[PDB]
Each structure stands twice: as structure tokens, then as C-alpha cells.
Amino acid sequence: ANQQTSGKVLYEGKEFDYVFSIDVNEGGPSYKLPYNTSDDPWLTAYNFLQKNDLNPMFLDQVAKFIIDNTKGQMLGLGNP
């Protein structure tokens, strides 16, 4: 596990591969979505959703961002 430990994200005191930082409420706790790059979007997102007690409506949003991290259409790309 963790052959490379370069970019890890801290959430509530724990470190994960890539946790996402979610803003939507102004003034209050920030939402962090801890994703391991070998885990499924809908699962990882569901994990945080049930963990922080969020609405199932959020699951697609968080999961899709998860995907793009390893996909590359929104922030990935890497194009000429």
C-alpha cells in the first residue's frame, strides 16, 4: 500500500489519496471527499455522503468529480 506518498490529502485529521474540497454552504464546515484512485466514484462518494450525513442527490456530483480526477475531461485533459 502507498508505493508513492507524494500527494495525500488531509480530511478531519486523516489522510487520503485525493479528497475533494466541496463548497456550497457559506459559513460552516467544509466538505471533503476522500478518494483512493482505485476506488469507484459512486462508492467513494457514497462513503462520504453517509459519513457526513449528506443528501443522496450529492452522490452524482461528488462521484463525477472523482471520475474526472482519473478521467480527464474537466480538469484532466493533458492536451497539446
Report how far apart, in Å, the C-alpha atoms of 14 and of each of 4, 8, 19, 33, 78 are.
17, 10, 10, 12, 30
57-78 as b/e: b if 16+ CB within 10 A: ebbeebbbbbbebeeeeeeeee
Domains of the chain (ranges; CATH) run 1-80 (3.10.20.870)
Other C-beta atoms closer than 10 Å to the C-beta of 52 total 15
